[PDB]
Write a protein that binds this DNA or RNA. Sequence first.
RNA 1: AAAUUGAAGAGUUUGAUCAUGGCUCAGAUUGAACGCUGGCGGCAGGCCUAACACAUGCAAGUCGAACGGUAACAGGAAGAAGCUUGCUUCUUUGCUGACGAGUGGCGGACGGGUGAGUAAUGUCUGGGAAACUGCCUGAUGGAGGGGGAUAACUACUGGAAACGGUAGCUAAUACCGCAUAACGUCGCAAGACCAAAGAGGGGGACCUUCGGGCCUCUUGCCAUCGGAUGUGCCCAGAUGGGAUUAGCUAGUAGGUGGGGUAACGGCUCACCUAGGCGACGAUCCCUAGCUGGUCUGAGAGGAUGACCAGCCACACUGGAACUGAGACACGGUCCAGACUCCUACGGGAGGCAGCAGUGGGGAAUAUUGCACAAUGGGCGCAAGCCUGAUGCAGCCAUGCCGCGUGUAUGAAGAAGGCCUUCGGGUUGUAAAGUACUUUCAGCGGGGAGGAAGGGAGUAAAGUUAAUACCUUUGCUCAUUGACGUUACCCGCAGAAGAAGCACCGGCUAACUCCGUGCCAGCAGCCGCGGUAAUACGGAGGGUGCAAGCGUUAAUCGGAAUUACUGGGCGUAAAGCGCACGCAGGCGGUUUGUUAAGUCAGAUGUGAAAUCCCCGGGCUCAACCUGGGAACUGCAUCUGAUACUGGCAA
RNA 2: GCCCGGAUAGCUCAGUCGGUAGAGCAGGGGAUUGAAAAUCCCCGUGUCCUUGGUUCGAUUCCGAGUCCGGGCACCA
Lengths: 82, 85, 205, 60, 393
Amino acid sequence: MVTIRLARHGAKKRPFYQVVVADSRNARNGRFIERVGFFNPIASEKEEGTRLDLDRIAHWVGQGATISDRVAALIKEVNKAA
Amino acid sequence: NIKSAKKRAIQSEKARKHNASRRSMMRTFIKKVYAAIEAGDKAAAQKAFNEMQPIVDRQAAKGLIHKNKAARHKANLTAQINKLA
Amino acid sequence: ARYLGPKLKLSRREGTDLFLKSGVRAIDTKCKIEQAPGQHGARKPRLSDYGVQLREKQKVRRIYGVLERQFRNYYKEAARLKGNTGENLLALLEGRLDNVVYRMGFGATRAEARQLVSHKAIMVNGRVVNIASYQVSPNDVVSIREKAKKQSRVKAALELAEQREKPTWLEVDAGKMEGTFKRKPERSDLSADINEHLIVELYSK
Amino acid sequence: VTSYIGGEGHNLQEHSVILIRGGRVKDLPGVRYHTVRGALDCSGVKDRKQARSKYGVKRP
Amino acid sequence: SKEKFERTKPHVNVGTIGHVDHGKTTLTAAITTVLAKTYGGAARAFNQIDNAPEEKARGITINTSHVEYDTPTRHYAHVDCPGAADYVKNMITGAAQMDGAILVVAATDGPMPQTREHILLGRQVGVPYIIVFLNKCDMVDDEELLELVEMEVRELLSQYDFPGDDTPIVRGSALKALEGDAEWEAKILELAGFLDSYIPEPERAIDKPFLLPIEDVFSISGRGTVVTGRVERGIIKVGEEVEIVGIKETQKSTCTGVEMFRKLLDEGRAGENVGVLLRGIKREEIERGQVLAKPGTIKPHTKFESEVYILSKDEGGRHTPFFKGYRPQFYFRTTDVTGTIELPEGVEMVMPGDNIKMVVTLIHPIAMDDGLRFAIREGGRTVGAGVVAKVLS
RNA sequence: AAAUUGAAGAGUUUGAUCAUGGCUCAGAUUGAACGCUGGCGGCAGGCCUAACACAUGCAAGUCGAACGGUAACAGGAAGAAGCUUGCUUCUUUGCUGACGAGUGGCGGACGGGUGAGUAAUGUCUGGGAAACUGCCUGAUGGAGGGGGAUAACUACUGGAAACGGUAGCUAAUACCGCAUAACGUCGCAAGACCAAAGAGGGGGACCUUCGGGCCUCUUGCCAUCGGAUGUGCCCAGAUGGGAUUAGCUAGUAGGUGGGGUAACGGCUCACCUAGGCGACGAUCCCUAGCUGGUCUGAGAGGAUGACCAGCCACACUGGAACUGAGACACGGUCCAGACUCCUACGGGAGGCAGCAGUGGGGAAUAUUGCACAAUGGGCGCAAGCCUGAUGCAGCCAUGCCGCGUGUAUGAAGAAGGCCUUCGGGUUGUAAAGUACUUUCAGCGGGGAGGAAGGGAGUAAAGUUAAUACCUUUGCUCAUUGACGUUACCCGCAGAAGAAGCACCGGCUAACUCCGUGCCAGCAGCCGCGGUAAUACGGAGGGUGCAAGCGUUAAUCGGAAUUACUGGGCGUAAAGCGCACGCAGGCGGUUUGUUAAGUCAGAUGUGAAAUCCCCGGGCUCAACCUGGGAACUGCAUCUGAUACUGGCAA
RNA sequence: GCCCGGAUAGCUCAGUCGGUAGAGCAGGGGAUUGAAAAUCCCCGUGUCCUUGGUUCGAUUCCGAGUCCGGGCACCA
Ligand SMILES: Nc1nc2c(ncn2[C@@H]2O[C@H](COP(=O)(O)OP(=O)(O)OP(=O)(O)O)[C@@H](O)[C@H]2O)c(=O)[nH]1
Ligand SMILES: [Mg+2]
Ligand SMILES: [Mg+2]
Ligand SMILES: [Mg+2]
Ligand SMILES: [Mg+2]
Ligand SMILES: [Mg+2]
Ligand SMILES: [Mg+2]
Ligand SMILES: [Mg+2]
Ligand SMILES: [Mg+2]
Ligand SMILES: [Mg+2]
Ligand SMILES: [Mg+2]
Ligand SMILES: [Mg+2]
Ligand SMILES: [Mg+2]
Ligand SMILES: [Mg+2]
Ligand SMILES: [Mg+2]
Ligand SMILES: [Mg+2]
Ligand SMILES: [Mg+2]
Ligand SMILES: [Mg+2]
Ligand SMILES: [Mg+2]
Ligand SMILES: [Mg+2]
Ligand SMILES: [Mg+2]
Ligand SMILES: [Mg+2]
Ligand SMILES: [Mg+2]
Ligand SMILES: [Mg+2]
Ligand SMILES: [Mg+2]
Ligand SMILES: [Mg+2]
Ligand SMILES: [Mg+2]
Ligand SMILES: [Mg+2]
Ligand SMILES: [Mg+2]
Ligand SMILES: [Mg+2]
Ligand SMILES: [Mg+2]
Ligand SMILES: [Mg+2]
Ligand SMILES: [Mg+2]
Ligand SMILES: [Mg+2]
Ligand SMILES: [Mg+2]
Ligand SMILES: [Mg+2]
Ligand SMILES: [Mg+2]
Ligand SMILES: [Mg+2]
Ligand SMILES: [Mg+2]
Ligand SMILES: [Mg+2]
Ligand SMILES: [Mg+2]
Ligand SMILES: [Mg+2]
Ligand SMILES: [Mg+2]
Ligand SMILES: [Mg+2]
Ligand SMILES: [Mg+2]
Ligand SMILES: [Mg+2]
Ligand SMILES: [Mg+2]
Ligand SMILES: [Mg+2]
Ligand SMILES: [Mg+2]
Ligand SMILES: [Mg+2]
Ligand SMILES: [Mg+2]
Ligand SMILES: [Mg+2]
Ligand SMILES: [Mg+2]
Ligand SMILES: [Mg+2]
Ligand SMILES: [Mg+2]
Ligand SMILES: [Mg+2]
Ligand SMILES: [Mg+2]
Ligand SMILES: [Mg+2]
Ligand SMILES: [Mg+2]
Ligand SMILES: [Mg+2]
Ligand SMILES: [Mg+2]
Ligand SMILES: [Mg+2]
Ligand SMILES: [Mg+2]
Ligand SMILES: [Mg+2]
Ligand SMILES: [Mg+2]
Ligand SMILES: [Mg+2]
Ligand SMILES: [Mg+2]
Ligand SMILES: [Mg+2]
Ligand SMILES: [Mg+2]
Ligand SMILES: [Mg+2]
Ligand SMILES: [Mg+2]
Ligand SMILES: [Mg+2]
Ligand SMILES: [Mg+2]
Ligand SMILES: [Mg+2]
Ligand SMILES: [Mg+2]
Ligand SMILES: [Mg+2]
Ligand SMILES: [Mg+2]
Ligand SMILES: [Mg+2]
Ligand SMILES: [Mg+2]
Ligand SMILES: [Mg+2]
Ligand SMILES: [Mg+2]
Ligand SMILES: [Mg+2]
Ligand SMILES: [Mg+2]
Ligand SMILES: [Mg+2]
Ligand SMILES: [Mg+2]
Ligand SMILES: [Mg+2]
Ligand SMILES: [Mg+2]
Ligand SMILES: [Mg+2]
Ligand SMILES: [Mg+2]
Ligand SMILES: [Mg+2]
Ligand SMILES: [Mg+2]
Ligand SMILES: [Mg+2]
Ligand SMILES: [Mg+2]
Ligand SMILES: [Mg+2]
Ligand SMILES: [Mg+2]
Ligand SMILES: [Mg+2]
Ligand SMILES: [Mg+2]
Ligand SMILES: [Mg+2]
Ligand SMILES: [Mg+2]
Ligand SMILES: [Mg+2]
Ligand SMILES: [Mg+2]
Ligand SMILES: [Mg+2]
Ligand SMILES: [Mg+2]
Ligand SMILES: [Mg+2]
Ligand SMILES: [Mg+2]
Ligand SMILES: [Mg+2]
Ligand SMILES: [Mg+2]
Ligand SMILES: [Mg+2]
Ligand SMILES: [Mg+2]
Ligand SMILES: [Mg+2]
Ligand SMILES: [Mg+2]
Ligand SMILES: [Mg+2]
Ligand SMILES: [Mg+2]
Ligand SMILES: [Mg+2]
Ligand SMILES: [Mg+2]
Ligand SMILES: [Mg+2]
Ligand SMILES: [Mg+2]
Ligand SMILES: [Mg+2]
Ligand SMILES: [Mg+2]
Ligand SMILES: [Mg+2]
Ligand SMILES: [Mg+2]
Ligand SMILES: [Mg+2]
Ligand SMILES: [Mg+2]
Ligand SMILES: [Mg+2]
Ligand SMILES: [Mg+2]
Ligand SMILES: [Mg+2]
Ligand SMILES: [Mg+2]
Ligand SMILES: [Mg+2]
Ligand SMILES: [Mg+2]
Ligand SMILES: [Mg+2]
Ligand SMILES: [Mg+2]
Ligand SMILES: [Mg+2]
Ligand SMILES: [Mg+2]
Ligand SMILES: [Mg+2]
Ligand SMILES: [Mg+2]
Ligand SMILES: [Mg+2]
Ligand SMILES: [Mg+2]
Ligand SMILES: [Mg+2]
Ligand SMILES: [Mg+2]
Ligand SMILES: [Mg+2]
Ligand SMILES: [Mg+2]
Ligand SMILES: [Mg+2]
Ligand SMILES: [Mg+2]
Ligand SMILES: [Mg+2]
């Protein structure tokens, strides 16, 4: 089962999450097909915070890939008309 | 062992008791055809072939035998009946 | 981390005035300058080609208050950057906060400017900075916080900065202790004495 | 192998376990190692001041 | 290492003292089976008090074995000493941690040379209290002969500076109480009463900082190196910084469990024998004689001034003078060490039975402070007691 | 608009010289070790050796919405008995929630670890045909009716336990016929065939025989064909050293008859042919996980494969197969072994190269820690379990990076050391001081940010017979943090708590006095000492780095000292003693044609990471990260035909 | 934790059952040379592993230790 989920990169106490399309069995940090945007929880109100390429999501979710708890909410955060 | 999921040991042993009995049945019915083949015309061999056909197909569909195994045991065995007799 | 020894000993060995023991009075005439590095100061040095490079390197180090490990890192940065390797070495040294704090006049010496940076006094773009090595980017506004503003060490030290040449690249308000770093420093603006070419020779071999 | 006992005087005799580092002496033909003074049964040189990591002595 | 030791009933360090082959070790075996059967504690046997090849083919004891027997009032911890003339060094470690001894003189033989040598070591080291026990009795069926030995023990103790007549003398066979004789079972139950009545509650030092002399080092298969010994002062919590000071040099460490006769502890208090497990230390590098101190409290020294009181023939010691260069054994807390003597100016010779101060350079450094008590020995006998005056190193 | 901007020498053979040629040195780097010495933080990392043996504990379970259970637990409801009539005793009730003991459908095969083995059954790069696929998800079609058991649980014995019995009772999504089902197997076809399982939250209407018949909604079960993910198979080239290993091979090499495999095939038989391999190095021997990368280098190269990521292999040693979609299974079964264990001596165990830890090995690498809060994964409608996978912190100057240890004034140019041209200089603005600040730890008050949610009862809008349950978007709630006395922001005091250790004859930045006298010792190379040592030991004086510094080992560099770029062979090392000559390398000159080489474009692809530019967040950097090129690749169709080869005359 | 062996001038060894220890080989130390080797003339150059005891007197006899050698055990 393919799944869109965070990878957890960056330093100690200073995380940075590479949202990525990977297989269920493979590890968090490990194997994947293609990365699709990112997320930063320690960004705050500035120029950049979160980016998520919605065109590639249609290729995977449209076919048959689940979205994890955190990535499903970032699709709500980025919005359709807000 | 140091796990409470040793149920699979006793469940797999319980499976192969059944799984071997249905498998051994199948290969004796196939042996019944090979027994009929050698010294015999197209009559005794094809009677055995009609008996083993439902058993090999059924066992194939349960996940004991694969669908191609069954397919070969019809294909090559019909070729013994057709060519010789 | 720092030198913290006899500072005017460094000026006699090097020969020229390093602005280590600059302070309140303008000229020292209080060390037998040039002709007394140590016990054997009357000894005329033969001075090889590796000598003159290393004497030139240590002079630029002891003026700006940087150590070889950090100083080598500036050279590695300088080589990768565009333009001339020599001009970038010294342009990176002049962009330090403890050097800019000295050039603004908030400190009679550079060690006083280093301590004033370190002691939560210096603040730039509305953010306090402790690091003497802080790379001050173009178009900034260094300043002193309201608690430590107009303390007895800064007001006497700002009056010394009137006797100094005063850089063109940076500007000072002088009333409210507020500075403004504008552009990057040019070779021809400052020094006109410490050679860069010889320090590029020492690190390329 | 043979190892050189660098420094004035030593505590090595008969047995006594010692540590060995690399380095030829360049005088005794055959000898091509150095005893580490300080480590294990090989003690420091008595009454040294200048250069004491070499020859294994603490502060005065 | 499983059951947690509950801190109830005061702890007291007891041990058997006496002549060779005198029912000294066998008394300890009798005390277990008697107290275990009636009160209902842990059983144990006479075998576990001394096994090995050395205490079977021979029969004699070398190692100071330990036993834990409990009673309604207090929780005793036994220390079975060796007894022979060759084993005086490892005995003194067992005898120093002992608070109240149980002397062992026998009704057939009576007081014999080692009994005098043992009690001599008890005074100068630290043995406040002592209890007599006649460990044969049944072999000589007589009223007059058995009671004549009681008189000579009262003479011995009083002659050597103990109470003597005030000490409660008990009679009883150890082997008879081992099986199940109702009269002799009850007579060693009486000895447990005499331990409770005569010996008071001991005075500990749970205030001034941590110290623990190492009596015998172990290497537990799984945990690491364990050091045993009575905590002389202070406390030990689990996961606390501890410095090992004494012979060789000085090493940093941390405790990772304290125990009490194969039972866990949270706080190893003062005045009780505990096995401290140290972290990241080998069996060979840590040796017997060193002390577990709290960092900064004590420093190892190889030279010191000390007020040495030399003994005479009457008190028991040397009987001839000596000059600088003499090298006797100095017994501090546990171990002994040799050292050269340097006398003060204006003192030509040191006569026996005299109070003087002297500088003593030791070959090994040992952890020490001002006001530490030691007992000098040489030639299989005592020499002089004293106290430390000043540190030098 | 930026991605390569790219290359140093010196000493040392001689009386001196030029050459040859080794030796050594300056530079980088490192999983590092030692020695002296040590103060803090950011991110990293931290058994390279004995794939040695391992106590101890904890690392995979989970659904009651599969059923049996109306129970070993703990608690509501119809009713009961004591008596302080609601306080107590207490039988029934799926009936209170659940979940202990159970049988199934799934998980254990992933996640982790470690390189023993493997020089090609592996890996890498690029292709292919003969495959299979659980979970997820596309679309279709079901989802007819029966049976037989069996555990648990009594009972009764066996046995010390481990485990099995012996008579039963008893569900089911467990189990098995049956009728059917072609676009799904079988030959050309008429034919012959094979599959299943119900749960849970609600219900108006009418059957009530109350077990509720029956409608809904979800999840789940059906053969098929899918997509995705894979997983096996195959070929080509590449992927170490040795010829003082030159011959190797009989299921060996093919073909067919049979046989097996998910499937191609000596994978395995029976025969038939008697080959196949090898100087483009077979076979045998030694060594070795492989790659992305790392390191060094101007680049070619040389070295390398710790850390992150992919692939392979292995699981106490040696076998073996079972169960499944997937293993010949790391905490599965089974034998045999060795070595620890428990035994009532009949028989039982056991497998850290998962996390800590011990001994031992070693020059040398870490706590029997802390939490599921996040991020994955396992389970499940989800309320949450378990997760030593992740997260953290113990320890460790082991790294890369930051800030520390004060900051102005200071003449008597103090003393003491130290050289004395006993006049004086020198250490020296150094100290003592005389002014001011207080970073940093150390006390104390405030206090971000890792946190998205999860959950309740809700509105509407879907769903439908329905304003019920269910679902979605608005929508009101209360809360969740191991790290944690966080990061960070203000107040306390007073320089207060905080500097070495190399070196000093040349190379190579930096001098003297004593002591010693080819002795004692230094030594990376040359070389220092024989009574005036700049090299030894001491002292001062300096110089160079500094929280590190030296030494050590290890790789590249300099070494154009294996030279492809880029060397040589008269005399320095080096032309076989001289011929003939097969394989091999190279080949005059002119047209024609193929295009193998070569060249040009084409599409694929070189996993992501680092490496390199334009940016951004750590107070700054180190670190972190977004994009860009790069990834000098290797294959694939189309042309260009000069050159080289092929074939022409 | 305890049993055993080992130690003699700078190095390699003799000597003892209480009668006070020697040999070679190094080194000395003036001759000699810039300083050695050699030639020449004269030297043991000693805590008998350390320390105490039995005694008139201990290398020598008996304790106690030193560091090192090899041996057997204990698991809070
Ligand atoms: N008759 C009798 N004999 C005893 C008694 N106790 C001990 N024994 C004997 O002595 C031995 C016991 O050892 P003890 O000497 O008492 O104790 P120990 O600790 O071994 O003695 P040390 O050797 O001094 O340590 C046994 O072998 C008995 O034969 C007793 O009470 N009565
Ligand atoms: Mg946020
Ligand atoms: Mg927010
Ligand atoms: Mg999930
Ligand atoms: Mg088993
Ligand atoms: Mg059969
Ligand atoms: Mg199946
Ligand atoms: Mg099945
Ligand atoms: Mg630094
Ligand atoms: Mg020079
Ligand atoms: Mg900026
Ligand atoms: Mg370079
Ligand atoms: Mg020197
Ligand atoms: Mg005896
Ligand atoms: Mg005894
Ligand atoms: Mg260690
Ligand atoms: Mg461009
Ligand atoms: Mg010469
Ligand atoms: Mg030359
Ligand atoms: Mg490194
Ligand atoms: Mg260290
Ligand atoms: Mg410290
Ligand atoms: Mg710290
Ligand atoms: Mg650090
Ligand atoms: Mg490890
Ligand atoms: Mg390695
Ligand atoms: Mg794995
Ligand atoms: Mg990992
Ligand atoms: Mg790992
Ligand atoms: Mg690896
Ligand atoms: Mg393969
Ligand atoms: Mg491939
Ligand atoms: Mg199929
Ligand atoms: Mg599943
Ligand atoms: Mg029906
Ligand atoms: Mg039936
Ligand atoms: Mg029926
Ligand atoms: Mg039955
Ligand atoms: Mg049955
Ligand atoms: Mg039922
Ligand atoms: Mg039911
Ligand atoms: Mg079924
Ligand atoms: Mg039919
Ligand atoms: Mg029909
Ligand atoms: Mg068809
Ligand atoms: Mg077909
Ligand atoms: Mg029909
Ligand atoms: Mg059915
Ligand atoms: Mg497809
Ligand atoms: Mg390789
Ligand atoms: Mg033939
Ligand atoms: Mg380079
Ligand atoms: Mg090169
Ligand atoms: Mg590079
Ligand atoms: Mg590894
Ligand atoms: Mg890969
Ligand atoms: Mg393993
Ligand atoms: Mg296994
Ligand atoms: Mg195996
Ligand atoms: Mg396997
Ligand atoms: Mg497994
Ligand atoms: Mg296995
Ligand atoms: Mg078994
Ligand atoms: Mg076994
Ligand atoms: Mg295991
Ligand atoms: Mg481990
Ligand atoms: Mg193993
Ligand atoms: Mg260990
Ligand atoms: Mg710890
Ligand atoms: Mg936990
Ligand atoms: Mg908890
Ligand atoms: Mg907990
Ligand atoms: Mg947990
Ligand atoms: Mg929690
Ligand atoms: Mg989770
Ligand atoms: Mg999950
Ligand atoms: Mg689901
Ligand atoms: Mg629910
Ligand atoms: Mg939870
Ligand atoms: Mg668990
Ligand atoms: Mg845990
Ligand atoms: Mg902390
Ligand atoms: Mg690093
Ligand atoms: Mg390192
Ligand atoms: Mg100052
Ligand atoms: Mg000085
Ligand atoms: Mg100053
Ligand atoms: Mg001052
Ligand atoms: Mg001052
Ligand atoms: Mg103030
Ligand atoms: Mg801070
Ligand atoms: Mg607030
Ligand atoms: Mg939060
Ligand atoms: Mg969450
Ligand atoms: Mg919600
Ligand atoms: Mg909280
Ligand atoms: Mg909590
Ligand atoms: Mg912390
Ligand atoms: Mg705080
Ligand atoms: Mg704090
Ligand atoms: Mg205030
Ligand atoms: Mg204040
Ligand atoms: Mg030199
Ligand atoms: Mg020169
Ligand atoms: Mg020089
Ligand atoms: Mg002089
Ligand atoms: Mg030197
Ligand atoms: Mg002179
Ligand atoms: Mg001299
Ligand atoms: Mg100095
Ligand atoms: Mg360095
Ligand atoms: Mg080297
Ligand atoms: Mg080289
Ligand atoms: Mg080269
Ligand atoms: Mg060439
Ligand atoms: Mg050459
Ligand atoms: Mg020649
Ligand atoms: Mg020649
Ligand atoms: Mg010739
Ligand atoms: Mg010729
Ligand atoms: Mg040819
Ligand atoms: Mg041609
Ligand atoms: Mg042509
Ligand atoms: Mg033509
Ligand atoms: Mg053409
Ligand atoms: Mg392309
Ligand atoms: Mg493309
Ligand atoms: Mg591409
Ligand atoms: Mg790198
Ligand atoms: Mg990174
Ligand atoms: Mg950047
Ligand atoms: Mg900060
Ligand atoms: Mg990218
Ligand atoms: Mg990137
Ligand atoms: Mg990209
Ligand atoms: Mg672009
Ligand atoms: Mg792009
Ligand atoms: Mg890439
Ligand atoms: Mg064409
Ligand atoms: Mg043409
Ligand atoms: Mg040709
Ligand atoms: Mg040809
Ligand atoms: Mg002379
Ligand atoms: Mg003369």
